[PDB]
Amino acid sequence: INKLYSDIDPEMKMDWNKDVSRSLGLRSIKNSLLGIITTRKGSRPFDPEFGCDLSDQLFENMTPLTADTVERNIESAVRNYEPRIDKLAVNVIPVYDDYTLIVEIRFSVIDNPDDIEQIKLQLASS
Amino acid sequence: SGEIISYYDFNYRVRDTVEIIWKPTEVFLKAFLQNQEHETPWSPEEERG
């Protein structure tokens, strides 16, 4: 299934043999995911709803609610624009000292819903 | 001297005799170089002004 979900390499790296480099299957799924999360809401040209907003103010102050509030959006955001993930779960650990959200996401691609894999993402700039 | 200049396919198959004229009046070949230049590319440019 790694053949499936052929997507251009986000970096457009030089691939050996000179063709466009590629993100392979499930390598792309991360990228699109990694893409959708960072993007500020409203920054899509005709789609305001895209991207998971982050308020550095709210990002500054973490509370199990504030965490939970964020916890939904990503889980919400990813769910709408990324049908390739069947069973997805988010974990967010906000870090107190620098005010950093680190976020874990365990998800399962459609083809292997029993398989589990996680990603590690952190956010900063408070 | 060798090799070959060209080939008359003859269009079909005959026996025992052949007669052929060049309908371009006995001259079969008129070779043409006309008008082409190779080099010309296209590029960006600053318009100045």
Add this chain to the structure above:
Amino acid sequence: MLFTFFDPIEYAAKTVNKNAPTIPMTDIFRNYKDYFKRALAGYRLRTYYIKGSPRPEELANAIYGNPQLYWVLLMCNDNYDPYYGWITSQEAAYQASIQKYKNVGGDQIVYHVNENGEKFYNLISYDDNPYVWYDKGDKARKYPQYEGALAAVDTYEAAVLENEKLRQIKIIAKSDINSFMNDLIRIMEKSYG
């Protein structure tokens, strides 16, 4: 949101060459600008200001909550181009200015503006009295067209004021935006035939 409204039209490329195939396409060749006058004339435009350098339609959302109507703003704005008609960030504007002047020259002092705000084009002081201004192409020594302390405008700064003007816009109320919409639409039916 408009051009999809009317039927797409077939179009021949004839007059490029005596034979070219005919192509269907969505119609730009209805004016829409008169279409949006008649209907527009019903209510009013309301001037409006911009908080930043957003995109027209990106900005078009926040007011109306609907990104789809940028053009409404646009035709009230009736700019020549959507790309340079809009508000633009400092970074781009400078670069834009950088671009346009670059061949001529960078950092080109565009004009002298007096205290009063009167722009003085093509002027330089002979430097003996920086306050007396002989213009240029003169070699000075002669005909100072003004004397005093004037500001000069940097091409960067020059770029700013240009894009600065774009800040305010005349817009129509988000209340009427709906009521308006139907009417023009109805007019287009009269405009279909």
Add this chain to the structure above:
Amino acid sequence: DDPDFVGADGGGDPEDIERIRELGTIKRETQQRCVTATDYDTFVSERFGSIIQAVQTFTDSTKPGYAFIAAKPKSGLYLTTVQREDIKNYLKDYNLAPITPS
């Protein structure tokens, strides 16, 4: 070569179990023999329609044993002879015994 090429030709299911039905439905109709009139010219113009532009087969009931076909070599207003011997030769393979095509 001609300037038309692919690395190789040949292949096939071969059968295409449905598609073959026709083929079977067909060849049962076929003849290696030539009979009537238009059977010939078809089979005929399969050869050098490049020469005979169109070959037009006909007979006369007054004279049996014989068949006539019409030929524009399209290289000439009259069909040249060397063809006429070349063809009828190749033709002669299939001739209904009582009949001599001409």
